[PDB]
Design an enzyme around this catalytic site. Structure first.
Site, mmCIF file in Angstrom:
data_model
loop_
_atom_site.group_PDB
_atom_site.id
_atom_site.type_symbol
_atom_site.label_atom_id
_atom_site.label_comp_id
_atom_site.label_asym_id
_atom_site.label_seq_id
_atom_site.Cartn_x
_atom_site.Cartn_y
_atom_site.Cartn_z
ATOM 1 N N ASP A 292 0.824 -1.203 0.000
ATOM 2 C CA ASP A 292 0.000 0.000 0.000
ATOM 3 C C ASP A 292 0.859 1.253 0.000
ATOM 4 O OD1 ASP A 292 -3.010 1.138 1.818
ATOM 5 O OD2 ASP A 292 -2.538 1.119 -0.321
ATOM 6 N N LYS B 90 1.984 4.664 -0.961
ATOM 7 C CA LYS B 90 1.364 5.829 -1.577
ATOM 8 C C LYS B 90 1.622 7.004 -0.636
ATOM 9 C CE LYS B 90 -3.267 4.808 0.293
ATOM 10 N NZ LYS B 90 -4.712 4.725 -0.033
ATOM 11 N N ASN C 157 0.067 7.356 2.973
ATOM 12 C CA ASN C 157 0.417 6.423 4.036
ATOM 13 C C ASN C 157 1.753 6.728 4.689
ATOM 14 O OD1 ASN C 157 -1.992 5.096 3.887
ATOM 15 N ND2 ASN C 157 -1.191 3.318 2.777
ATOM 16 N N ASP D 95 -0.835 2.241 8.033
ATOM 17 C CA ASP D 95 -1.830 1.453 7.307
ATOM 18 C C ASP D 95 -1.203 0.186 6.749
ATOM 19 O OD1 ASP D 95 -4.696 2.120 5.114
ATOM 20 O OD2 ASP D 95 -3.943 0.303 6.042
ATOM 21 N N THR E 98 -3.746 1.145 -4.563
ATOM 22 C CA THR E 98 -4.371 2.251 -5.273
ATOM 23 C C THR E 98 -3.931 2.229 -6.734
ATOM 24 O OG1 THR E 98 -5.006 4.617 -5.105
ATOM 25 C CG2 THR E 98 -2.641 4.114 -4.793
#
Ligand SMILES: Nc1nc([C@H]2CC(=O)OC23CCCCC3)cs1
EC number: 2.7.11.11
Length: 340
Positions: free
Chosen positions: A156, A158, A161, A174, A191
């Protein structure tokens, strides 16, 4: 590899595995805390700033609604997130202080990092200079070296985060898609702008997806926008799988070279996934000025210290409608979440 790194990683894995095999459970309860403010909200959970009523410490409490987790097929993912977080220990990962569950919700009580998302700061200033991007990138490289050595894939990465702490360093939050994987895994998650081609193409994939995502992150930090940008996901995905990327002329040659090797559509040729592993990244010319040990030890002055007034300041986060934390009088989904 330097015996020093080997021995560090061996100890890191020993310590992780002891907690992995015997996870902590039920280490606080909801009425130990006061609610302050909602910091984020999604389809099955929220993050709320809370204050411990006895110690006065602030925490970012992630609250997941068990029924919605079940409906959205996140059971295993939520169990992954908590089991991993209670077992890891690294300077650039937000720490899990407590966890518990009740009739309705799962709770992960994390340290509160008040400086805001990297994303906010990036959008405020437009783009980061190469040294600034490199400081953050180096922290992600070390974090992935740590996680991947434990057989963990993060999945994840990005800008939202990556939280900026009181010293200007990143802490990753996260772990909802993080997973312990020896070999391959298959779930579609992440994402759109950050997905590796092999995820889009529904293949069995491995930790190389994290290194692809690092390429996206570095590009976005240095350009101000991600490399495969388009208006709708399907158009993004077509660009991702194409094998083409265009670089701003302001990028250095070293940055472009690193990015071509991270944004390599053939996962068998991608930096971080070759015989020399992370060292192809750490030894790249774009990182020639990086003092990896000093970064790890938090001895480098950061690019900027976020502006905030104290450990309870929420100014760097956004405003959301404040909703109840209701706890049903009947236990929901007890079987599914037994191990939490
Ligand atoms: N010689 C050593 N280097 C370290 C650090 C700093 C670094 O470059 O990598 C470590 C070890 C591996 C995981 C990430 C952090 C510890 S002893």
């Amino acid at each position: 590899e330097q015996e020093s790194v080997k021995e560090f990683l061996a100890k890191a894995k020993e310590e992780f595995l002891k907690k992995w095999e015997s996870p902590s459970q039920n280490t606080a309860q909801l009425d130990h805390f006061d609610r302050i403010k909602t910091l984020g909200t999604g389809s099955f959970g929220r993050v709320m700033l809370v204050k411990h009523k006895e110690t006065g410490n602030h925490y970012a409490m992630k609250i997941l609604d068990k029924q919605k987790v079940v409906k959205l097929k996140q059971i295993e993912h939520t169990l992954n997130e908590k089991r991993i977080l209670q077992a890891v220990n690294f300077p650039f990962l937000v720490k899990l202080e407590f966890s518990f569950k009740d009739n309705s919700n799962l709770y992960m009580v994390m340290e509160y990092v008040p400086g805001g998302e990297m994303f906010s700061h990036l959008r405020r200033i437009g783009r980061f200079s190469e040294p600034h991007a490199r400081f953050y990138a180096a922290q992600i490289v070390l974090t992935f070296e740590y996680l991947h050595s434990l057989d963990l894939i993060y999945r994840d990465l990005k800008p939202e985060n990556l939280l900026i702490d009181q010293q200007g360093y990143i802490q990753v939050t996260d772990f909802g898609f993080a997973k312990r994987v020896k070999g391959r895994t298959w779930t579609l998650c992440g994402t759109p702008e950050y997905l590796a081609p092999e995820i889009i193409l529904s293949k069995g994939y491995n930790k190389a997806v994290d290194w692809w995502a690092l390429g996206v992150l570095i590009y976005e930090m240095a350009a101000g926008y991600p490399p495969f940008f388009a208006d709708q996901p399907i158009q993004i995905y077509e660009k991702i799988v194409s094998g083409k990327v265009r670089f701003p002329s302001h990028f250095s040659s070293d940055l472009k070279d690193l990015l071509r090797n991270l944004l390599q559509v053939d996962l068998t040729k991608r930096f971080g996934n070759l015989k020399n592993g992370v060292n192809d990244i750490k030894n790249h010319k774009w990182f020639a000025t990086t003092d990896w040990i000093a970064i790890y030890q938090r001895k480098v002055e950061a690019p900027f210290i976020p502006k905030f007034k104290g450990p309870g300041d929420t100014s760097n986060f956004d405003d959301y409608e404040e909703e109840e934390i209701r706890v049903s009088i009947n236990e929901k989904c007890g079987k599914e979440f037994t191990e939490f």
